[PDB]
Symmetry: D2
Subunit: 344 residues, 4 copies
């Protein structure tokens, strides 16, 4: 069919629409509840063998809105590619023990504070300057998809860390993905997405991709079909946004996605940083448009620094076939699967 047929996993995206509904304001905030953190389990659990990497997800049913926390206890070297125009971010350290992704827009950054505080307690409040427990956080604005103003707070972040376990990730509406949505040319056509992950082991090489797509654009599959977002209930069709944009221009102008890619392959800070950018850009294949002024698109690239690539890039497949760029490209397909899991 197309060039990527033989690496497509045939994810079974549900053709059924799930419009997010109209923007209804006046909803109750955090101070209207004795909020109870709930462990997020999603529609399905992904389980994977990546020692040292744990994941927790929690949500409030009041929202619904949640946080998803990637816990790497030992700490890991990190590059951040904040490429969107509306990025809400905390820390953005080049070394992290946890990455916290959350709804609630800028207010949801508080969840990450809950994680860092909890990690300090777990360190029993040791305060060496080279002993900081570092947490980077990113947020999506999910207030449009729901009639409540509840936001992931300190307690929910702490809960998410507490609910963290090795090698598991809740697919679908869970954690930060509870009220994520796509396709925002018009809110009438916006669909709920969710969060998604995917994992691959290549020999000893491990790659985990985590994504919470709350795009202005729509989610598309490797066949080039729009599978989530911009659904018109009148036509039953999901058109690529560019057709609405085209027509909007003819009429009126007459003459956020937060993600993480985690691997165990050793990369220098410059390799890791470019790796981050490559994989982030590859996501404009599965999300369109992407990296727009409206989006706060932020990808974290994390390495546990456990295995080395060969000193020379050579193989029987080519002289330049085993390096970071080859990895970022294998990783790009894992991330696309993760995006399709979120949109499934």
């Amino acid at each position: 069919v197309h060039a990527l047929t033989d690496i497509d996993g045939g994810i079974a995206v549900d053709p059924a629409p799930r419009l997010a509904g109209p923007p209804v304001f006046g909803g109750p905030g955090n101070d209207a509840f004795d909020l109870a953190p709930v462990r997020s389990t999603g529609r399905e659990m992904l389980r994977f063998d990546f020692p040292g990497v744990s994941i927790g997800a929690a949500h409030y049913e009041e929202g619904p809105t949640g946080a998803t926390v990637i816990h790497i206890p030992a700490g890991a070297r990190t590059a951040v590619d904040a490429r969107g125009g509306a990025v809400g971010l905390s820390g953005g350290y080049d070394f992290n023990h946890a990455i916290c992704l959350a709804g609630g827009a800028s207010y949801g950054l508080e969840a990450g504070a809950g994680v860092s505080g909890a990690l300090l307690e777990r360190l029993e409040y040791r305060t060496g300057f080279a002993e900081a427990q570092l947490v980077s956080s990113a947020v999506i604005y999910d207030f449009s998809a729901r009639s409540t103003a509840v936001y992931p707070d300190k307690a929910l972040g702490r809960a998410a860390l507490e609910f963290a376990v090795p090698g598991e990730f809740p697919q679908g509406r869970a954690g930060a993905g509870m009220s994520a949505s796509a396709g925002k040319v018009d809110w009438d056509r916006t669909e709920i997405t969710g969060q998604g992950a995917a994992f691959r082991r290549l020999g000893d090489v491990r790659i985990l991709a985590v994504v919470v797509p709350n795009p202005v654009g729509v989610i598309m599959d490797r066949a080039g079909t729009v599978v989530r977002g911009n659904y018109d209930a009148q036509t039953g069709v999901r058109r690529h946004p560019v057709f609405d944009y085209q027509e909007a221009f003819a009429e009126q102008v007459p003459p956020t996605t937060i993600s993480a890619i985690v691997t165990n392959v050793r990369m220098s800070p410059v390799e890791l940083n470019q790796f981050a950018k490559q994989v982030h850009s590859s996501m404009h294949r599965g999300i369109q448009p992407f990296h727009t002024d409206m989006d706060g698109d932020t990808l974290f690239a994390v390495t546990t620094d456990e295995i080395d690539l060969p000193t020379t890039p050579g193989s029987s497949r080519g002289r330049l076939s085993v390096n970071a760029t080859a990895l970022g490209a294998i990783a790009s397909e894992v991330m696309w699967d993760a995006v399709l899991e979120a949109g499934k």
Copy 2:
């Protein structure tokens, strides 16, 4: 079939292979020739109506290698998105009278100096504070695809500017595109590309896309077919690089594209900058992988600031259907067309 069928123009990419051949090192440089600039006409000439924007292209047969210059006499606000890990850039100004694209790797930045010197002469050497004739230059490494070390020098850049005429662009092997090539997992599979352009007018809105793709990755069409690069002569097939990278890791790890988008729509510095990133990332659809450490990918987004978008984004197609993001997305498809013309 796929979501972008209705905006695809059916560019007829030639199935016929054009491998670059193997790397032959030790050829003669500029010193070995009395180099005479040839005006580039390419396989075909695109003509477009965009007042104030001219293009010139020149090459040395002795390379073969060349330079392509976008000349906007009145000067135009510019944003630069230098994403790759191997960028060769000069100037990078937020306002430019010319953009110079050339082969010859870093040495070919000299062609842009030839343009700036020539423009200074034209201004009769005026050097007042606000009178700079600003030129931004970017290069590709095109020495692989030939057995000569001749690079675009000061003279060639000057020639390219002199050959510059309104509303024309030579498609294919012309200017900077004379020895551009794609698909470099192994040089045996590498194919010659070329340079390409496309133009679209929407009412008064104008969008020109110029591209010189010399990717590590390959060129792909909207159907998802690899149409240029990584051609295996033994199989007659162009596989997606990921399959080569995949097998290479199994075996060995057991357990540049320079482009410009030029429009006449008024955008603030922030909008133009984000517009550049969006359009640049969108190119990872037509080129894969893209923005890699091996690539010096650089896109210039240029506006002549001649027409306004409405103060509100609304239209019958949605409340957020007329803005810079909408424009960047219409522009993304013009650029894909340009990439296909280069790989045609």
Copy 3:
């Protein structure tokens, strides 16, 4: 005396040493106490006339540690210059309703979340896309100046906002400045500093400088005298760090400051951004060394956009005498005063 003599106001910095004491990187944390927020009054109250700008400061005696909040109810355009190698920053928005400075290293970023939560309550929980109350926060590591692990939390941040009043700032050991210290070539020579603010009105032009210096380097006055940090109790002398570093290299290699500048002068994003960098770099005069890999130096430049500079920069003092650069240089002196107040 020196070029700046006529601009200096003879701030009376106390000659008396106040070494922080040997660091015990640890101690009782926030859970060991029932933390009671204390409105900070420091050693002295600075009173200024800048309508629209309020300041609150709070601390926990149990640290001691604290948070200082600048609250601009109407919101103001902001530029962030995060220059150090160990920055702890949340938000970093280009438009803020509050800036939150705090101790507690990264953990202290929680205080800023307390402010943003409060502000969302005050807005009775409206979450309109353009209704966000935005808060940017930065932190200093002040665990080395105390035998405690208490850090500014959500509650302390909220208190600081609550204690915020127009035109008042608590000089000295107050808010974020409670346990700030300077001069860390060795902790045995490290002195407590504090927080400081200065204010100047030029006609209608207003300039407020707020600073919390916790440098690796030392504070120095306009005469070039080290007046806080790197105090050697044996000699009674504060040497410039460079002499220690110099000696250290002969022997062993044989052959954070967070600040804000708030003004009412209209500046474009580009101008405000460059204004921020200029003022920030000017602080390497009063703090040496500065912008080091060990520091997380961050300056916020905030404008209430109320008065215009003339369209041309001319005056009797010169053709380039009235512009943003002129302002950033008037502002640089205000900020140096604030630094000296902090070290007083």
Copy 4:
């Protein structure tokens, strides 16, 4: 007298004025002259012992304008801090065989091309994939200190490379420093500066500072005295710019420096990059104001990666006394000396 007295070398700055005169445009350019390169010898030759680092400097009398080239044949890891708001840069590579500093504003970037083209010819046009000879260039606008439009062209950059010799730097009016000038609140008070260099060896540690100050601000010595720039011929006094700016505002608003630091101490890309920023910011001590919107301030930090620093930072002078921050501070003083040599 002041904290730095003991590190000051008592550079004998000439008190005599050397006003640049006013900007007068319309003068003849390169086409009016049969330009021949002159090896710049300046007022005085600095000799230094730094194997592997050469310096060439050439100028055209007809400008007078020139280029200064730092040649490191073996190539060296580089970080670039381009702070200013009016930067003119070519290449900016993280690995360089030469750094080219020149007058002639953006047009002067052409001199760098002359270097690169000459290096290619030396390599005999070996275009090996990784045999690139990389040259990074920066420029100052010196067209305001002379009545000509002559700019450093390809031939002059070549000449500066060809005149390059080990361990020699021509102080004063030489190379890029021919028509550099300082203090530009008004052109009538602007003074010619020059270029400067200083060198220090600590054991086997070697630090070379090169600077071409063409500041909007004025050069100041360690005592805080204005020594070059803003000289009023009527008063015989050089005031600090802030006094002119301060008076300008009352009246009208009623109610580039390019430089390089070269060392042989091994630093990681992240260390080298922050080292660059620290040293660059330190220069606001000797140049005031600095890093302004009107300046294109660019500093290159280059390491030959020859000596290691200890694995721990400890010494008798303190726990944190031997590291890249310590080196960047030792380097800061070498750079200040070079600034004073330029203004001498």
